[PDB]
Design an enzyme around this catalytic site. Structure first.
Site, short mmCIF file in Angstrom:
data_model
loop_
_atom_site.label_atom_id
_atom_site.label_comp_id
_atom_site.label_asym_id
_atom_site.label_seq_id
_atom_site.Cartn_x
_atom_site.Cartn_y
_atom_site.Cartn_z
CG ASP A 139 22.04 -8.02 32.21
OD1 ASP A 139 23.15 -7.52 31.93
OD2 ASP A 139 20.98 -7.65 31.68
CD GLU A 168 25.65 -4.95 34.39
OE1 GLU A 168 24.46 -5.28 34.21
OE2 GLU A 168 26.32 -4.35 33.51
#
Ligand SMILES: [Ca+2]
Ligand SMILES: [Cl-]
Lengths: 496, 9
Positions: A197, A233
């Protein structure tokens, strides 16, 4: 780090967004394994802030409090149980790793956390890890506010607080070692890889230093020397100093141009047409196919505020959405992830949804179980896109044609297109405002094929449309622009 | 920004 580590001939992963561990364990056994799914991306499994205003939003799970495996999805026993049961039927688990930051700097200290752990953001005390003020970037960041203020400055994007989230000092060996301890706990349980993330807000070299510390995958399920699948990401639409290619040394990256462009094309916005997809892939400026994790929507931008805004197709636009997922699953570019969502009361004011924070279906904050309806969709307001016949059968199509070249492209210069995958599959789309009735070269061996969009092959019968391929490989296709699903797909395993 | 512009809530 580039290989998904899926079983032979399974080519997709599904994000079971906010599902409970016990429901994912059951889903692995009752659906994902028999239908050929490669793996599951799970919501972050580490303890997070319990946010009560608004009431338990989905994004509270991106504000860590500790690395205990204790969340609204379940405890460590249930997590271990899920990973073992899925691995035992050949379906992998990929973990959403939230390692850029802990929780918001303005969160009130106390024990409002999913495992009751104490934490104090103002004093930077997370004793359940433990982290102290020495473990954050307060002294490193150079902005007046301490938050990220200018995205043309690649340094502050990395060292300052993303919307006030306490930024971990990822250059410190101690912090890298706490994070690696967390990920190694997960690896030894049996997870196959990680979504990293907020990777844009981490230095590529700090990510490398954490990954350097990771074990190989659990040798009960994976061949010796197997490495965790890494997909980072990074939202890179161009025009910024940080490029997703800066992360290729660590693993794959999310290609957010993919769904934004495909949504605009299938919506026929901004002068786009499906015929323009003939050179889909790196021809559109995407990252190399072997470094891409692709998807039509994800949990974030399906709420319309994200990369792509209103052009992103979601389950709310089911008819076009099925077409976009079908094109993605048929096309060889990238490793494909399918979204599986829950419904929420969407309420747009000025093009943005004021309820985009709402969390999973719940009773007073307790997540509701996934129930299976008689038609094999889901109840309790779980959408279960991955159980829609049109999507599940294209997950299988992609398995069947794996490795075969993109070939036999047709287009009408507008929005009627078709293409094959070697001699194993063929797919035909009508996105124009008139019927598509045409004989096409399919590349497939002669015979009768069940269309897997309108129906299924069961025994030696089709439950929907049948396509007749003649000895020359040609077949007639008829698709009204009024058709419920205006595309047809046939492949080697749908042949009677 | 991040998380469907969570900070505006
Ligand atoms: Ca950072
Ligand atoms: Cl993502």
């Amino acid at each position: 780090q580039y290989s998904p580590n899926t079983q032979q001939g399974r080519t997709s992963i599904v994000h079971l967004f906010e599902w409970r561990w016990v429901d994912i364990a059951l889903e692995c056994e009752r659906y994902l394994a028999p239908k050929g799914f490669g793996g599951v991306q799970v919501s972050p499994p580490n303890e997070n802030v319990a946010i009560y205003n608004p009431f338990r939003p989905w994004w509270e799970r991106y504000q860590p409090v500790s690395y205990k495996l204790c969340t609204r999805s379940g405890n460590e026993d249930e997590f271990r149980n899920m990973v073992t049961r899925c691995n035992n039927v050949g379906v992998r688990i990929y973990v959403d790793a939230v390692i850029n930051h802990m929780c918001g700097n303005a969160v009130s200290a106390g024990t409002s956390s999913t495992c009751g752990s104490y934490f104090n953001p103002g004093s930077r005390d997370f004793p359940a890890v433990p982290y102290s003020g020495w473990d954050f970037n307060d002294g490193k960041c150079k902005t007046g506010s301490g938050d990220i203020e200018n995205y043309n400055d690649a340094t502050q994007v990395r060292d300052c607080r993303l919307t006030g989230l306490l930024d971990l000092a990822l250059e410190k060996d101690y912090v890298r070692s706490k994070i690696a301890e967390y990920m190694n706990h997960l690896i030894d349980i049996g997870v196959a890889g990680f979504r990293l993330d907020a990777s844009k807000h981490m230095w590529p070299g700090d990510i490398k230093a954490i990954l350097d510390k990771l074990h190989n995958l659990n040798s009960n399920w994976f061949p010796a020397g197997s490495k965790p699948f890494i997909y980072q990401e990074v939202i890179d639409l161009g025009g910024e100093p940080i490029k997703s290619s800066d992360y290729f040394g660590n693993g794959r990256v999310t290609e957010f141009k993919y769904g934004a462009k495909l949504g605009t094309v299938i919506r026929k916005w901004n002068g786009e047409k499906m015929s323009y997809l003939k050179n889909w892939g790196e021809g559109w400026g995407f990252v190399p196919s072997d470094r891409a994790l692709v998807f039509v929507d994800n949990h974030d931008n399906q709420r319309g505020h994200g990369a792509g805004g209103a052009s992103i197709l979601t389950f709310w636009d089911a008819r076009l959405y099925k077409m976009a997922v079908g094109f993605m699953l048929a096309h060889p570019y990238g490793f494909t992830r399918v979204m599986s969502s829950y419904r929420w009361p969407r309420q747009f004011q000025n093009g943005n949804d004021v309820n985009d924070w709402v969390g999973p279906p719940n009773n007073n904050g307790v997540i509701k179980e996934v129930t299976i309806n008689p038609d094999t969709t889901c109840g309790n307001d779980w959408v279960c896109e991955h159980r829609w016949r049109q999507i599940r059968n294209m997950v299988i199509f992609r398995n069947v044609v794996d490795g075969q070249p993109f070939t036999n492209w047709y287009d009408n210069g507008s929005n009627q297109v078709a293409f094959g995958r070697g001699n194993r599959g063929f797919i035909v789309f009508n996105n124009d405002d008139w019927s598509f009735s045409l004989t096409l070269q399919t590349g497939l061996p002669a015979g009768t094929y069940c269309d897997v969009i309108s129906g299924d092959k069961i025994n030696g019968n089709c439950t929907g449309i049948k396509i007749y391929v003649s000895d020359d490989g040609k077949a007639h296709f008829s698709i009204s622009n009024s058709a419920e699903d205006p595309f047809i797909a046939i492949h080697a395993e749908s042949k009677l | 920004x991040p998380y469907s512009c969570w900070v505006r809530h």
